[PDB]
Amino acid sequence: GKRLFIIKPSGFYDKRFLKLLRFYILLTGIPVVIGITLINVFIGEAELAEIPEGYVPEHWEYFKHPIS
């Protein structure tokens, strides 16, 4: 007798859009975070060596991060 029916408008569409939003962001949020972490913990960034004598680098091998 103490409890009564309380009225709240239609939380189902709220919850459905929120669940779909988080799932279809995190479907390739976590694999890309795992990918970038495994890159910069198992491949190296680079070192800062000078240009050797009689040698040319390309337009890559000027950049720190390996995915860059």
Add this chain to the structure above:
Amino acid sequence: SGYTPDEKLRLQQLRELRRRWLKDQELSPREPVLPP
């Protein structure tokens, strides 16, 4: 002054209807919410 008796009778019909609605607004199967 006071009420005209039309207002008294109309008010009594709304008393019966309002009390029946507000008594209906309790949920009590004694299983009110349930997971699907």
